[PDB]
Amino acid sequence: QSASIEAKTVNSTKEWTISDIEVTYKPNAVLSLGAVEFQFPDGFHATTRDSVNGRTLKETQILNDGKTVRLPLTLDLLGASEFDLVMVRKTLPRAGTYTIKGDVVNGLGIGSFYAETQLVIDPR
């Protein structure tokens, strides 16, 4: 029923060290219209070097000072049961817990779709 999302810092876990961040959102339902959206709080920044499903992000999909990634459901995305976002060699922000969100926006407007998860950065 429920859309899920999951985040990990892959190379490391500590404030101010460098790591890839993998975030995977699955809508657990069929998609046709709208756009997939990841929402980050401050401390994270997407760029056109990051990727979703093997494609580097474009400037038009990055908003909100890098904190929001919005992907219109083009043919390449419609195939997919999941949306694997990768943030490449990011400096991790200060220790704490951080809520990272996924959803489908500009859809039919009828559906679960929201999802969210906590990513924890550890003390230095």
For every residue of the chain, DSSP letters joined together read: ---EEEEEESS--BTTSEEEEEEEEE-SS---SSEEEEE--TT----TTSEETTEE--GGGEETTTTEEEEE--HHHHT-S-EEEEEEEEEP-SSEEEEEEEEEESS-S-S---EEEEEEEB--
Phi, psi of 27 (to 5 degrees): -80, -10
Experimental method: X-ray
- 72-79 contact pairs (CB < 8 A, 24+): 72/34, 72/35, 73/31, 73/32, 73/33, 73/34, 73/35, 73/36, 77/36, 77/52, 77/53, 78/31, 78/32
Architecture of domain 1-124: Sandwich (2.60)
CB–CB of 29/3 below 8 Å? Answer: yes
Residue ranges of domains in the chain: 1-124
Rounded Cα distance, 38 and 116, in Å: 9
